[PDB]
Symmetry: C3
Subunit: 333 residues, 3 copies
Amino acid sequence: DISTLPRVKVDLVKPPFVHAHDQVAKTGPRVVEFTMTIEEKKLVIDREGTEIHAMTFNGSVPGPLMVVHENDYVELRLINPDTNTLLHNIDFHAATGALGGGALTQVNPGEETTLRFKATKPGVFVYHCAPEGMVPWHVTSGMNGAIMVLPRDGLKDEKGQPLTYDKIYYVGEQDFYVPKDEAGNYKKYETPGEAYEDAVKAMRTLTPTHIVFNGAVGALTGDHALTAAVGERVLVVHSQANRDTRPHLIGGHGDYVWATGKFRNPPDLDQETWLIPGGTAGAAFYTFRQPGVYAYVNHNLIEAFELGAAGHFKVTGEWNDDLMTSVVKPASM
Amino acid sequence: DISTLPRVKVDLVKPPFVHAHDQVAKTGPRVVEFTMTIEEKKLVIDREGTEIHAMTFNGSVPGPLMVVHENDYVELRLINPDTNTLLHNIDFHAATGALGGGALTQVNPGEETTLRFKATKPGVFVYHCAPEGMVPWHVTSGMNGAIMVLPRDGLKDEKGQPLTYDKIYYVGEQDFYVPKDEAGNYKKYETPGEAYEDAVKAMRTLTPTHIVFNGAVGALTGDHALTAAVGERVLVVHSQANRDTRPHLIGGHGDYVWATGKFRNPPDLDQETWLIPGGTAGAAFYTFRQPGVYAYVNHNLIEAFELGAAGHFKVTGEWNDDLMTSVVKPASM
Amino acid sequence: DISTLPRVKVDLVKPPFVHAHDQVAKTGPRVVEFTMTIEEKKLVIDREGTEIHAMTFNGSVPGPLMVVHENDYVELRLINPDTNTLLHNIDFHAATGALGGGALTQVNPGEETTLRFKATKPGVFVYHCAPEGMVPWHVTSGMNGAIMVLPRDGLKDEKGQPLTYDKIYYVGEQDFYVPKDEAGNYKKYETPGEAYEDAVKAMRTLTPTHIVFNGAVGALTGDHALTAAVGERVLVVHSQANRDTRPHLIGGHGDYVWATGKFRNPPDLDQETWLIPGGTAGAAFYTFRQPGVYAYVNHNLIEAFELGAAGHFKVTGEWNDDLMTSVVKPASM
Ligand SMILES: O=N[O-]
Ligand SMILES: O=N[O-]
Ligand SMILES: O=N[O-]
Ligand SMILES: [Cu+2]
Ligand SMILES: [Cu+2]
Ligand SMILES: [Cu+2]
Ligand SMILES: [Cu+2]
Ligand SMILES: [Cu+2]
Ligand SMILES: [Cu+2]
């Protein structure tokens, strides 16, 4: 009887950070309560100042990472304020039935709903809006996030031994399709309805104009670079709700990788690069061994370095000359 | 000596249905006899009435699913009636030698041939036409199907326990490249030879105009929705002879997935979405737990909902409020 | 102390051949010394005579396959002669730290450098140039190769039994983006700097103009077809530094496949086709069972047969009619 279970209220944080949780469940199954507020907002997505009408959960692209344990119940209060103009809903790939919740969560501006589902399968999973007839438009406007469902005894390696992270980040990768005129310049629009047909036309090209992490070119760089220390164990959760990606830590590896994100499967070891299919979340575990700057990219390097799918780690600690050294520094001879 | 083996004649059915077979082999190895007749035909592939010159095995896109057991012999009589205009052949990815049979099966209109091969490896596999110099044109005109080679003791899970399906469907996913004029409208053509160069030009864009299941937008919807009941175990075989796909059951999962289709490998568990590479068949096993409508898509949702790669299940039975419920239905407050 | 280790000098060979090595390590850990010379050169990449300004390691596209064992040290002397015009560097996906070596290997024309790293993880791995701000331009100009890091006890199957190859080939697959004018014809350029913006524009289309093995359409055909004999065990290493590929042996299989190339993972068995993500090397083991001509392709068959991603094997030996036979040769009736 679900009414006899503990309830725990989660307070979300903005990606790439992740709300507090325990890897190994410190309680029995719980009803874990989340609230998200839909926000339609203008976002500047590149260095040129290109501004799109984003559709967000909780103000961010991606939406925040939700974390529960296997056989917890997720109870989400979804709020669509009357400052928004569109109908929205939510589909959890973690959930079973009713299009992952989308059939039960249709909220007009000025409405709210509360969905509950049982998180019966452990893994990282995409969640996304999906209103009948307008599904790719909402998703490719940024209206997607992820949920992690941890096994109750935490993560395990390919031999059944514990894998415990010290830090976790969530990288949401977003393909945008900003409509272009014949000359190649981006168009702007007076209303979503006046934008819709051109959004459909842009999407049908199948060719993104931008591919970004955390909502914009350069979002995970500078003062917002990801951080770690030598010897820290770091889990990077990575989602892509609509297109394939091929993540790569430049100067590192995925020591243990669930490329399609489901923890009952043994991870792939020692990956350079892995394929997260569109419509999937994946997760990579790495122990840093060298200090300095790393880039974290989609290893279609055009997508990375021309279209935006690149972030950075700044790693502190000591350099290991056994692992790598310059024997003779660049010089003329 | 193959002449001492039983012969069994199969009578194929139109996709997404699958001819009768036994999961666990009820006989020793057999010569399993199939006949397919090539049919060049006009097909309407979208709601707008776009009509292409399809190249089919047995009248359908995809061609029918053939089913045998490991170390059976497949003996295919392939008929190219003189009502057709082109040379055709067949390559089985299941087979060993002679380009998978393509080098031995070249049939002009008014010819037939009979190929035999030993099905030495268990899995689902693509078959497709492949005439030297015109290979992608035939394949992307719809001239591809799949063959399932079951292990003689049926399917097994990641621990070696039986997995037995109650129902099986075959979803063939087809990328078409309908040539377009400068304005973006589809062209039509008086002869295959007059169409060929424009077909090559359209293909070289690498950008499909349509991506469909069972030969047309909406083919697996309405009166042709796939069906199941709560508690039924369903195997969905999915092929894509030319491009990657990323299948997803909206509101469900792949409980056990052979993403690259080969049954000697343990399946991936609890998948949301998986990557079937172009040139591959994959297979997903799911036990339905909730009634209602499901969509089954390529989770590039543009490909799904704008270009055609979406079908439906209609599932009967009782709703499980433990697994999912609306706590508070959408309302204004 | 690395100075007490044996040093061994390798002399590289041109792809698709591979320098001499031992599968099972016949010594303890070594410092394995390689030298590569960067060469900017014009290359004709298709049958039409299309000529690009290639950026190569050691004169070839791909660069040569380097082979070491796990926990050897790779010591590479990288030479950028003053006959070249650009700055170059090298990132090893096999290595840990400093962007895989790229931060430590920046060489102007007329400079050289020597990098050492410890090959701590077994697998096939991409190496590629990656100069800050110009990374995809160098990679998609052909400036990438691969390194194999063998386990010290050689390769093993999914049960821990030895897999020993008789022959090894390296197939490097290269996506090129040759800039096109409005009419669709390729442009040429007077200087790299005058070419750069158009190269960026061509790349941002995400649509390759050419996809080739060993540097050109048809490179692995005719007098340069790959060879084998019936019963020989053949490892094909395949890299793609920038885009996904889906390799397939037409008429064969990957008996054992490390699709994402890392040998501590059990291989996938009996693959028809597999997905090597962009930014990855993979490796397929096959034992030939039939003589004759095979094609080895990217199984986007447009990419294969229209854009160049196809090579051939010529296999000697006896035909096995049990495995495949024509029962009735094509005839009219
Ligand atoms: O490893 N990044 O090119
Ligand atoms: O789960 N389909 O978006
Ligand atoms: O198997 N090659 O189409
Ligand atoms: Cu929405
Ligand atoms: Cu979805
Ligand atoms: Cu044909
Ligand atoms: Cu094929
Ligand atoms: Cu370079
Ligand atoms: Cu790289």
